[PDB]
Amino acid sequence: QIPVTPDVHYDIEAHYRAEVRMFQTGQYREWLQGMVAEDIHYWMPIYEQRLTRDRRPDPTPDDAAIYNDDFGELKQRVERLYSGQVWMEDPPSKIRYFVSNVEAFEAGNGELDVLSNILVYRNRRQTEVTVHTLGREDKLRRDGNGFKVFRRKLILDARVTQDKNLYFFC
Amino acid sequence: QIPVTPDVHYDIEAHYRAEVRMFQTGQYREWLQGMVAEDIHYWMPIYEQRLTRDRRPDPTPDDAAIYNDDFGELKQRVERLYSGQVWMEDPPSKIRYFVSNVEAFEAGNGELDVLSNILVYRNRRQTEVTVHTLGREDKLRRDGNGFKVFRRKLILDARVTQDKNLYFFC
Amino acid sequence: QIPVTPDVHYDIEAHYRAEVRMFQTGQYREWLQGMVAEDIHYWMPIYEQRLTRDRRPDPTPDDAAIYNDDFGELKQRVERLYSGQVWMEDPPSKIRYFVSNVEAFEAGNGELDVLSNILVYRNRRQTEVTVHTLGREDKLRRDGNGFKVFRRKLILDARVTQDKNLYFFC
Amino acid sequence: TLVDTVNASQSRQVFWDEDVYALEIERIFSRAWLMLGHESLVPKPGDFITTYMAEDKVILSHQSDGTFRAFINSCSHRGNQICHADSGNAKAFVCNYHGWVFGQDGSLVDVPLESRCYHNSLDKQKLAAKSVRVETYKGFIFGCHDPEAPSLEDYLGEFRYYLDTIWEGAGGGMELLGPPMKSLLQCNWKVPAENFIGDGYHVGWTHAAALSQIGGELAGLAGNRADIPFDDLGLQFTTRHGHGFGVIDNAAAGLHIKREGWTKFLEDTRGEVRRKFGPERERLYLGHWNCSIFPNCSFLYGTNTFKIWHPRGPHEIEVWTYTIVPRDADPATKSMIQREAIRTFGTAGTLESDDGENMSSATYINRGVITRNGRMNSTMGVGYEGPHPVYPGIVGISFIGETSYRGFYRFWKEMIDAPDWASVKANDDTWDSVFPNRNFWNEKLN
Amino acid sequence: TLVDTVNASQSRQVFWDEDVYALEIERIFSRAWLMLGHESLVPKPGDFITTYMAEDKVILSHQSDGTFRAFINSCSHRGNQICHADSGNAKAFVCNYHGWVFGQDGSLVDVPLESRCYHNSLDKQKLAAKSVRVETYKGFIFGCHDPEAPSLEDYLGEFRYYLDTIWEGAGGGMELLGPPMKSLLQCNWKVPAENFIGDGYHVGWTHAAALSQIGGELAGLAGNRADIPFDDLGLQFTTRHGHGFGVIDNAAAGLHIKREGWTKFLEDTRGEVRRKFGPERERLYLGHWNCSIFPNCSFLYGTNTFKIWHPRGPHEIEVWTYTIVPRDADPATKSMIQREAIRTFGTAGTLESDDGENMSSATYINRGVITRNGRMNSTMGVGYEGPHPVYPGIVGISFIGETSYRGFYRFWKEMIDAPDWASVKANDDTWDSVFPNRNFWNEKLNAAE
Amino acid sequence: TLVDTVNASQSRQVFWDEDVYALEIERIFSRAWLMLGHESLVPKPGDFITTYMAEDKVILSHQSDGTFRAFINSCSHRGNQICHADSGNAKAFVCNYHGWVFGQDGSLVDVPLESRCYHNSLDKQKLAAKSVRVETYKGFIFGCHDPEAPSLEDYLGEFRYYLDTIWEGAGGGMELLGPPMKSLLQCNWKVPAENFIGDGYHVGWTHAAALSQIGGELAGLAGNRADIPFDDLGLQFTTRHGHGFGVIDNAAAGLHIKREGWTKFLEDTRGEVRRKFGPERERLYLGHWNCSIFPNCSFLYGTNTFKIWHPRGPHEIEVWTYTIVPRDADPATKSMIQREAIRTFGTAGTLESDDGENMSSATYINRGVITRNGRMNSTMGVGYEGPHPVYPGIVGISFIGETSYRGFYRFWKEMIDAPDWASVKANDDTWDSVFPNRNFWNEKLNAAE
Ligand code: FES
Ligand code: FES
Ligand code: FES
Ligand SMILES: [Fe+3]
Ligand SMILES: [Fe+3]
Ligand SMILES: [Fe+3]
């Protein structure tokens, strides 16, 4: 897989910066419409801790996952953070994303394979603070308005989640 | 609402990196002289936790703020760190900044509206560590071939600050 | 004192992103071969807390350091993660790097002086999480269509390390 | 008084106090049967999982001989954790510090340099990793530290009447799908245990948004409006050893959006349940259950999430979430149930995500001295319950009700007061004297 | 002993020990009047704030009827925190676990499904959120958990003589400006309490660089050198219920750089203060105060920062910082006072930022067994203090001294030692025996002029 | 029983229980001599370091007459830590809160405004920072809090026979190089202590990888092969006050890859060691030691890492790691030893990084009540040990054995059971009765040769 040119790199980073702004400002409908393809698979597998001698395969979409969603399932998830009226989210919890190490590769047929590191800082109420780190593996399509994601795989670094929930998008 | 060219974006990123390095190396006088406009308003509001139903307006500069400074007031703050003998800062505490999600927009008259995520890692003495996240909203103007900030609004993520102080610049 | 051009800047960032990828995926041999020069000095000094009035010089390579290695000694370190069943690393622990504020300067003889901020998040077993922040000061030279590091100085922000070990590369 | 069974209230200290917690560890967790997993998690010989019994790490292993055994996951040399893997297949486990080798039942089977350095003087028979008693009920695997405990069969007791409906059902019963989600939640273990055993009340309030979105059957619950005859719509149950649940009739698949296979499965098997277990239990088979098995296992039957609340002191838990599915369901039906159960009740659950603060706030509010010396009320439906002519145990008239809270805290008190199992067993015939309305159902059903 | 009132020392255990802290919660925080806020924070019917009494969360509400009430922020069903808003306007508060509804006084006013599911068989009278006794003084609102406690006015006692100078003043008194800054600090609550009650001594040492930078009146203090006749420059005061403060003469606005409106207001109003309260209290009205109200509220009158030190166990606090301003000041003055007060003493304060290690180190050094079995000294100026012919309580000769430490710890000891309020009241007339120099002020003043 | 010396087992409670830890603080850390450093760390008049004695912070200072003193790093005013610097040179230390000035021995020598504000009435001689007894052995510096403790020489006791081999050696002895690495490790302080005192057994299992890569002498330990006569290859030693070590013959520089200077230094000095101390000690001089000095100091002689395990409660330590080097080695040799020592055993050590989980898991596994009411076995080699005709104390036949564990826990039990030093001393004649095989070495050595 050939690394993208610096100008393509730029556009990919710009796209991810705008995606993060949508998340941070609660513009989830606009994100689904403008940034996510209708054939999306949005996937966060549960990885167990295994001995190195263990030859079992890595998790597939048929196995346990925290997220394993199509476009309609994402639309469903997004609406919770509208309308609430969800009392834990009155007022909305705060979230801030630090995306780093974006590397893209041309994948044929106009598509891109993109890796990135994500740090997510969350605050709510008076003193509640939680932090998550993840890898992201995307496939992006070019379209008439930039890029849309059609496959997103999120790899959590922590086996045991030190938070009340993982109810945020990446 | 016009996003900047890649060449302008690069210059802004370069400006912010140089600003961070001034903060990290204690060159506060250089920062103030070269990177801050004499018409600066430096502002970090106090945001209370309110119910969504609450219809009171957001904080303005007439309300409680942790910072609410003009240039002369920043100069005063600077000199405590730059010249004072403050025993907690013998030797200087350590600070490291991670600036992410820089998005700039051409405003009128050569001015820029610039948005930024900031993660601040602080260490002192033997085992003390504190960590802050915030949003930054700047108005910059070109100061060829660099920039100077003339409005800076800093949005703290945490309601209750888990640190001795917030005596650092962003 | 000459900062690099934007194109050279991009190339240094892309080099660093590839480096990070190699660390995160355990490709240490490939790193040593392709990204590290044979005249490398890889150095992580121990900085003590001293009063400002102290006039003693900064640590040199003849003083205590956590790392103080030539290429052969780096090779030795790299194999511990290969040529050994190390039971703490069965399976390997997870590490994720957030590199920011990369600033590069043309240093003479075609060599580059490069500053960067590093945030390193590590997870292992069920609930273990440790976090490190460092400054990195490199001298790089051009090698083919990329770079190799020939001097790396790592400046830890914490006096007392809050982790079992510092057995990771930067 | 920590629990008042007469007036149905509890001290706030039960969610907060360190000494109360220590007594729980002694008199509940070191005495009771605790959920370890299911045969489906360790299906082949040599298969194991690592898990917890309260704060003790244990290894559960499918033995070469087909039995299931468990042991404390701590080396008999210097104490190190024997195995760190979540799951795998192992003929032996080796401690990583010095290489002592443990068998599938925790026996010390070999030590490096046994002849050379120990001079064959090491008495390996006395150095087994501590065994834990293991018993199975319909494929579900429980452990117990107390050799005086009743059989698992007797600990479930009359609760088996109910569990047989679903864990036998049309004949295939149910199983667990892993790997589990694992998360820390800063609450006492009893807050979620009581929420799942009996908290129909909260559903329409806390989850009003989720129910309005999902639409369909359960949607009516949203807002807890006064005009609905909830008592025409379900029941609540409690038993001698604290186990209980509420049921919403005809709502098993109510929170699933894609449910064709699960809905069809129930349609296809309900007739066999009617035959084997009677119409009274066919009713349950088609209902949605919120259930806790005393002390710290809970599940939703219908939505099909399955949870163990592992205590980490009085103010934290580690929550493990599996999916529970019928064994005889087609693989695709099992996968769809798993996706819907995780989307509603997993770590990013559209419903579960709503509950975190409910649980932690009920706990941590008691940081204040004036606050924790207050009490909590669980009197909802008191007197609208009693022995039933068909259903064993004690039955309340609605899934919105606190019958099962009352049974839970009654048995919690009984256990905390009893110095041993013999004392508990002494009370077997009189346990339900605190439900004074003995003619309620006869008079009501007439 | 924990506190030696004869020789003016304290055990280091008072900053560290868990059982001592537990006795404080029971015998001070569960007993005393604690600062909840001010009418200005809850000014209109229905207006509420959430706050702390020690480690208990409380709601304070301006009732439809114009009175103020408070209650524990914990639902009577399963205990859930009722309200998470910092402030607002509400006729009711709804517990969001199951929807129990609580009135502005904490009454249980609605229970969802009461008929259907409770069968109207819930006694809502026994299920009010727990009430907190509230009384007010000059708009400042306090709470108390002990029904045997004296009135707030008797609890302030002779300290009202001082407070009336500034909380009535020319007629308009003072009020609080929020929202508050909130921050955690890893220290015992008493370290900041004592620092504000009486620590003139640290100012010239710790804040030397801030003082020398500002220049002006207070800048003379920088460095703590012998040059200055400090005692000519101010006084220190302590009272029966531990309340105390230091005053620097004619220095009220000395730390404000932009201070036109504030200085003008003092000049404009000092006359009426002289007429009402006399020359001796006009002196105080123009002075800079560093004050603590026993146990855990503090303020600087002049600089105008106002602090509550909410304990979180013995080795942490949550500090809430408000601004205190005269009600009758112009809005532009009020906003300027707020800016100056926050720039000096807020979370990024140019002075306050100097003190955080002074507070935490004094606490956490006691991790060591040998260390904590030591003691602390507060003997500065002992015997240069006593009852005074004009000013009530006990007066010491300088803002640099420890009269107010001694007063603070004496009362702390009295309360910690007392099984009930009756036993405290039983020593109202002999509290100040530990200050033996009865004719100190007679002799000082006679011999003077 | 917490320690069974008859059957050589211990309760897991010793790694976990908070009340056991409190007893250790009282009966071990406040009783014994603890390692502070070495003259080389404070080599000139005025030089100082900050360090710990268990959880107490101390200052160690080289006085003007070349003696050393130490004192608790806490101000006698309000308790503030006096000095925050790791090291430096100071004729006085000034507390940052109010500026009280402490001398090199912790005496309170000056206070700001002593005349003006204290009226010269502060009794400064009663307000010294608390002294700690300081004694030195061959340049190594120890402290003790217990007035009744025996001399440092008597506490080392028969262990000095061993230490003189290397801390005198050919005449130059050894010194420490700093600054130290400092890290937190979530383990009980005893797990590393025992690991270093006697755990030859883990080396070939845990460090097999590191060993295979280094090659040479110690590489043959990898995988712990049953065909090797380990007892031909070393010995293990324990002594009356808990100190012990294992020795691997002829392997001093075995983990060093660049070792020309160190290997030549040993070759050039062994002759004089044989002369002074006998071939029995020349053997030790050329060997690799793993050593603990009771309670919480450990070192590897040969690899030359030197560790102090400072407790932070029963479930945490702060590890300080120095390099130990011969004084008479060339500067180039000392530098090379430090690089090799750090590369194997520092915070990023190629060996040390393997051991963290072994330390922490043995501790935290005891979070579970059923687990912590279990026991730990240390029976390896029992009965293959006894008094020796040449070597003092109790000697075991292999560096792979638990002789030194048994000695360590025997002394721990003795200290914990003893209300004072007088009770300990009363066991001096019968301390080793728990090693029943009294004729083991006489039969063995006679059947040999
Ligand atoms: S601790 Fe398990 S083999 Fe030694
Ligand atoms: S906990 Fe408040 S309504 Fe149930
Ligand atoms: S605390 Fe040290 S001088 Fe006051
Ligand atoms: Fe729920
Ligand atoms: Fe101060
Ligand atoms: Fe080791």
Numbering used by the authors:
A (entry chain D), B (entry chain F), C (entry chain B): 5 to 174
D (entry chain C): 6 to 451
E (entry chain E), F (entry chain A): 6 to 454
What's the paper's own text on this?
These enzymes share a single electron donor system consisting of a reductase and a ferredoxin (BPDO-FB1). One of the terminal Rieske oxygenases, biphenyl 2,3-dioxygenase (BPDO-OB1), is responsible for B1's ability to dihydroxylate large aromatic compounds, such as chrysene and benzo[a]pyrene. Rieske oxygenase systems have multiple components whose function is to transfer electrons from NAD(P)H to active molecular oxygen and ultimately oxidize aromatic hydrocarbon substrates.
The asymmetric unit contains the entire BPDO-OB1α3β3 hexamer and residues 6 – 454 of the α subunits and residues 5 – 174 of the β subunits were modeled into the electron density. The three copies of the α and β subunits form an α3β3 quaternary structure similar to the quaternary structure observed in all known RO structures. The loop region located at the entrance of the α subunit active site is disordered, with higher than average B-factors and low side-chain electron density. The mononuclear iron is coordinated by two histidines, His-207 and His-212, and one aspartate, Asp-360, at the rear of the active site. In BPDO-OB1, a clear bimodal electron density distribution was not observed, but instead an egg-shaped electron density above the mononuclear iron was present. The final model has both molecular oxygen and water bound to the iron in partially occupied states. The BPDO-OB1 crystals were grown in atmospheric conditions, therefore molecular oxygen or water could constitute the fourth ligand on the mononuclear iron.
